[PDB]
Amino acid sequence: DKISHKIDIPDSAWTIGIGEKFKNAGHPNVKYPMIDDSYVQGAPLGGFGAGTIGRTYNGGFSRWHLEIGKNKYTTVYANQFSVFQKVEGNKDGVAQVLYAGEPENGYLSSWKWDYPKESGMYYALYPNSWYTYTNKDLPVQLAVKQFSPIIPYNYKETSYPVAVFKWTAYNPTNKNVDVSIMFTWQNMIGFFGKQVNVNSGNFNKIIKDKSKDSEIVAAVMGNISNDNEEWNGEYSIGVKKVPGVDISYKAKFVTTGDGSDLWHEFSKNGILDNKDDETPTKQDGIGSAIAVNFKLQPGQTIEVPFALSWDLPIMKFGGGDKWYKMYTKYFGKNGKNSFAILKEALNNYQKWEKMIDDWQKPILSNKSKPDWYKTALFNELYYLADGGTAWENGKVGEKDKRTNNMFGLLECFDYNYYETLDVRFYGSFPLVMLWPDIEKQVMRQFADTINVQDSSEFKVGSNGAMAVKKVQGMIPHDLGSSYALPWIKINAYDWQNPNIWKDLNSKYVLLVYRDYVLTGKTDKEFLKYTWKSVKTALDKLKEMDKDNDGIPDNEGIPDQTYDTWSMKGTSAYCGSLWLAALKAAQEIGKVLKDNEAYIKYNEWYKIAQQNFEKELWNGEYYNFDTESDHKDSIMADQLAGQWYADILRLGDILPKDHVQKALKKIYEFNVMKFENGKMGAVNGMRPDGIVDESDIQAQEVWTGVTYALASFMKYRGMTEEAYNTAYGVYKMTYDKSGKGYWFRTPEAWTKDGNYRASMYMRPLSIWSMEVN
Ligand SMILES: [Ca+2]
Ligand SMILES: [Cl-]
Ligand SMILES: [Cl-]
């Protein structure tokens, strides 16, 4: 490994061997079908709302999120980087696909598959990832850095459907070596969302941009149709000329053949035929290839950038709506703009790298923080782009343009709901902290639904009863499903009735006030916009106080985010959120000079606080609730209200002494008595030190709950406990001794390490650990 010298991989990058087999991998622990794509994953490529592509540590383009809101795991074998090398003086060179595996479908038999084991490494620190190739049969050593310009406080490049592949090659040997690097790509028009003749009309064209000192050669892979089908658009791959490198190309090879049309050229001397052919295909799949060839002298280094773009301008959801994706604002909507996107990337990638560096460096250079923490903090952000993210720039065939661009991130793929608010309470820290204009947009979207009334009925999954879809004054669980109508038809979720949840309205208010606080307490307009919805939300919750203790009553069913775990009476969880929400609304009242509201919420808070304290404080911790069989369980999340109050600078809603004791209890029990504190905080433990069996969710660790708990610990000066607590989640996710959930962090696991709901929004809450 002489190539690690020649590139700058941060020490805190997640790392694994190319072709490594992992033995310990967890699987779903539920009886219903649940996604399990295996541990062969990697950092995603693609911007917010662009659709993302998961290129795994083995080199394959395998996890396809190009259809917005869907997860399709399948390796498109034609999509690869390959290398040719010939030592000066030898008769023959060698050619190798940089993929640790081979096709399962008979095609491309001529290519050299099965990249050997123990011959290179994969590294990731999102949005960056790297491959190193250190192969006894490749005298020139190779590395690539790949990324998308995911950049905080930037809403432009961050939207781009583009990836850069920055290659470094170095000759440590005593003889000259001829090297070729070749990028192949399948014309994947028709791969998603086309019912018949999936390849029909696909054609490929080569663009040579000869602008002086900025020469680019690219393939554009599209379709003859100029219609605006949601499957239509273009892919582009290409390369920028650098001194000392020659470019070659092949416009059209058949992907549904043996591959020799291309490979007989590449394997001979690493130079392609440069054959252009714009003839559309009918049945056969087709692809394009871009290569560079160069001679490396002893001790010489060369750097050459490739790029990939995809212009798929329209997203269609199952309910029929068709929307333009955000990046269309910058490149156009007609689906014929792949080359422009690619070119912007090839000409600006260095600037993008520095912008990413500028953002990561304050954290990476902080020598007080361990490497594992950094690994998790950055790599958890994968989900922001990878979470079925929808970001619209107009409905298709809309006359009126709007000022606003609606956004949504999925709960997960198994539970296909946009912006599940009970979850985003945890999972939206990165958006408020790094892309706050999106965050405020999302919360305006929630404000606008408060008073929506939809009197149509639905069957509640848990119990069979009928219920009203949306009630005036009750915040929605979610903003729809990719299978239906995102943003238009809310409350796609039906497992419980969210119109009687006791956490949604409180969390809504807490999120509003959070978003004001963590954007510098200057955005009075946002408070004005949301003020009425805040008062409605709290006033409707007050009415669910059946027993006149000043606090909404849990109703002996799962009426909150723990949607199989029944709460009854006053709960620590919903009770503390309520206290915190009342305190936040008082503060908003002071800010907006609304004396009537200040007085009302202050009075409500004083009564509720005293009653909460008297009903739940047992002298060690706050009981789970007042009326359950399991009322004295120790709930990891029992003081969620106070956690938020710390972030929102609302002071003590509960006495400092009691908080400290509760947190110590949770660490001693829920953490340290659960598999020795190596796997997070189990949600419910009995006071005798055995896990609560009342419901599966009590027996689960929730990744997003544990990261949030860790931040609460940290704010309260329990530094060791905080990081020890978080460490278990890191360990399970990323470590060789864990369960193999990198780039698919799940909601939850049980004691045995098996999981529920991979690729989940809630653990983005690790960013609460960075709160200033
Ligand atoms: Ca009550
Ligand atoms: Cl256009
Ligand atoms: Cl360390």
Author numbering: 31 to 802
What does the paper say about this structure?
To firmly establish the mode of action of β-d-Araf cyclitol aziridines as mechanism-based GBA2 inhibitors, the 3-D structure of the GH116 bacterial GBA2 homolog, TxGH116 from Thermoanaerobacterium xylanolyticum in complex with β-d-Araf compound 2 was solved at 1.9 Å resolution. The −1 subsite of TxGH116 is well conserved relative to human GBA2. Electron density shows unambiguous covalent reaction of 2 with the catalytic nucleophile of TxGH116. Reacted compound 2 is anchored by several hydrogen bonds. The OH group on C2 interacts with NE2 His507 and OD2 Asp452, and the OH on C3 with OD2 Asp452, NH2 Arg792 and OG1 and the alcohol of Thr591. The OH on C5 is hydrogen-bonded to OE2 Glu777 and to NH1 and NH2 Arg786. In addition, the amine from the ring-opened aziridine group forms a hydrogen bond to OD2 Asp593 and to a water molecule (which also interacts with OD1 Asp593). There is insufficient electron density to allow modelling of the end of the octyl chain and the azido group, which extend into a more open region at the edge of the protein where they are less constrained. However, both the hydroxyl groups on C2 and C3 of the cyclophellitol-configured aziridine form hydrogen bonds to His507, whereas for 2, only a single hydrogen bond is possible with the side chain. In contrast to cyclophellitol aziridines, which mimic the 4H3 transition state, β-d-Araf aziridine adopts an 3E conformation which resembles the 1S3 initial Michaelis complex conformation.
GBA2, the non-lysosomal β-glucosylceramidase, is an enzyme involved in glucosylceramide metabolism. GBA2, like TxGH116 (the bacterial homologue of GBA2), induces hydrolysis through the conventional Koshland two-step double-displacement conformational pathway typical of retaining β-glucosidases, progressing from 1S3 to 4H3 to ultimately adopt the 4C1 in the covalent complex. Very recent publication by Shimokawa and coworkers reports that a GH116 exo-β-d-arabino-furanosidase from Microbacterium arabinogalactanolyticum termed ExoMA2 shows similarities in structure to that of the GH116 β-glucosidase from Thermoanaerobacterium xylanolyticum (TxGH116). Both enzymes have a two-domain structure consisting of N-terminal β-sandwich and C-terminal (α/α) 6-barrel domains, the latter being the catalytic domain.
